[model samples]
Target: IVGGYTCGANTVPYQVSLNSGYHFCGGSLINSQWVVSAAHCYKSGIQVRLGEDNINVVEGNEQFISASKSIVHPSYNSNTLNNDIMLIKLKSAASLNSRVASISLPTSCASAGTQCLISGWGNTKSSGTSYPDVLKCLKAPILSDSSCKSAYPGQITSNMFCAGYLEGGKDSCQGDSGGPVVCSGKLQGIVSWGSGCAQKNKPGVYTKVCNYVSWIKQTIASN
Candidate 1:
């Protein structure tokens, strides 16, 4: 999910601090102890930082959690971008008071026609400036399975879900992978891939959270 509040002096960009500040992206707390993010975002030197808007402004004062383990879905393949989901286990369960709490995964998958919100700090203008500090969001009605099959033309799968405005100008992009795609306040999907930021015929692809609920539950349980 996009950071809930706008960044100002009181608010700063949320910082997910890594060991040496290398290439990375954002994630969300889905379990009291685990942060859900894209597998590509799961890299060495990565640390999850939150509760700030500006990384530089909130440097040493932010909470730092060392990932006890970085768990990516075994099916995840960076080239294909399939199963682009990962879970970062906190050294200990985070103290979930204040601004930190787990996002609720869907109890049951949404019907094909449901509407949802996809948001992130991705590029604001297509082929141009991406909002580095600002979070933006767009709403998309869920695609009918048949429609998705036609638009995606065999590229779509039952394990993956798509949602977006068919007209374009709004979507999750580069910085958006692994972010939440929420429907009725339920975590239904994780932003997996798309053709480009807000492009026609290239709706956002996401991991069908419902499809993996059993695996997620077992993983969380065993941990």
Candidate 2:
């Protein structure tokens, strides 16, 4: 989260930290028993920590649960990073509270210029490494599809879109994948990847959550 500030506790309540032994990625609570995140971050024995603020310390409100099942997109392409979304069923249901909650899925597609909220414990440095103990957040506007395509030719697809400033400043970087990208009170995207940490002409890319609404609904219903 380049150039973002440390977020207040419970401000981004839907955020969750994914870990086995160490924090690897971020995720969002879609429901009491389901989490939506980037497929690339999936692994066996993954644990989901809800209501976390500063991950380095033990917080009383946090809930620790294991992944019961993982459902990665059927057509997910690792090389191109297309369809890079995943769903994880929790071993136990997460209790909802002021410090813990589920986020609503997108009701409609987010348009260009929409100011969105991005939060994570990912790298904060634009050129080196620094993972904040507390969660960080920034407000960034969604970039046009055409502009995103031009920024990374042959990389941008309908399944993915870019957000953040093109001039390089704030962005969701490494270890942020699968983190929540909220726009207009809804989950519009999951942080995926980018060329560098907020480099020029390289905005952070995200999995277009609107495109997989049906898939998520079906996956949750059938399983």
Candidate 3:
């Protein structure tokens, strides 16, 4: 993320690297065997690494596991980016440690003006092409629905929300898709897409996790 700083190791234990040959996106461990991410991030043979801090090194605390199944939402629409969330089932359950844990889901919807935190190994600059070796984090204020709608007219849906600065800095960049958007210590959103990384008046759009709680529970039960 641009204007973000390197976060402490294991500070966000639920953070996961969604690696498809390489780290292309981020995910959050919500349960022992399930990870929540964006539907658009799905790729063949996707693997996840938990307890990861530095992407360049294989930390002893990290657990790399292959995903046995990737269940994208039935209503996911790539064209409009509707229902952009997804869930991945790990082949083996992750063993929770001090550096590997699951994050709690939100029981209520995220309010506008709430200060949320996002972290990933995305580019440090909007024009940058490469990601960082270590994870980075930054705080972003959730924009009001009206403000978000004004920026993305006819695009914003109830299942989606926006967060970031409108002045063109301090937001998630390319390579940070499907990352967690934590609000009040809860999993509130999943990074979906944006006009451009930290662009002027273009806040990052996310899949509203609260709207999919029922679907998440049903999917997990059926899986």
Candidate 4:
């Protein structure tokens, strides 16, 4: 979060932080028992911190739960960073309330230029460790595939797209991967990768989530 604001309590209830003793990645609660994060966030163990506003404070509304299972997209290619989506199953369902709930998945893709909400514990700067204790958020507009492709060349794929300022500043920095990009009340993207956070012509890239609705639904049903 380079140009961001502190989120009010319960501002984004679906947003969650992935922790393995430390906050590593960000995620979204898609349902009572499932979470959506980035495949690159894969780890042997992780705890989902839900309804959390400030990690530094024991806000009492936070719910800490272990992951029962995690499913990365089978086509995920770490080399190219394609199909970078992942789904996590919690050991138990979260008790829904005003401070903890799930967000809806997108039924359709968001068009270029749509401003979306991105919140995470990612670095406040492009380099080094500036991870925030409180969640940070900003509005970044979606970039066109052509413009984004021109910036990275052969890196952007059907499963990925870019959002943020081409002129630099305001982006989901390192440690923010797997964070949600919500547009019109739907989860449109997941922070994946980029040349660098908020660099000129190098907008933050994300997993195009609407393209995997079928896979997501079936995978959840499989459990």
Instruction: Report, for all candidates in order, the number of backbone clashes.
Output: 11, 0, 0, 0
Alpha-carbon lDDT, every model: 0.66, 0.93, 0.91, 0.91
Better of 2 and 4 by TM-score: 2
Q: Estimate each model's TM-score.
A: 0.83, 0.99, 0.98, 0.98
Candidate 3 lDDT, 73-184, residue by residue in tens: 9999999999998999999999998899998999999889999989998887877576789889989988999989999999999999999988978888888889999999
Q: Alpha-carbon error at 60 in model 1, in Å? A: 10
Model 2: CA > 4 A from native: none
Residue range 8-51, candidate 4, lDDT tens digits: 87699999999999999999999999999999999979999999
Which model, 2 or 4, shows the larger lDDT? Answer: 2
Minimum summed lDDT over a 10-residue window in model 4 is located at 122-131
Superpose all Cα atoms of candidate 2 onto the true structure and report the RMSD in Å to 1 decimal.
0.7
Error of 2 at 119 (Å): 0.6
Candidate 2 lDDT over residue span 95-129, tens digit each: 99989899999978989999999999999998889
User: What CA root-mean-square deviation does each model show from the true structure?
Assistant: 3.7, 0.7, 0.9, 0.9
lDDT of 2 at 135: 92
lDDT at 211 for candidate 3? 92
Identify the runs in model 4 with alpha carbons over 4 angstroms from their true place: none
The TM-score that candidate 1 achieves is 0.83
Best by lDDT: 2
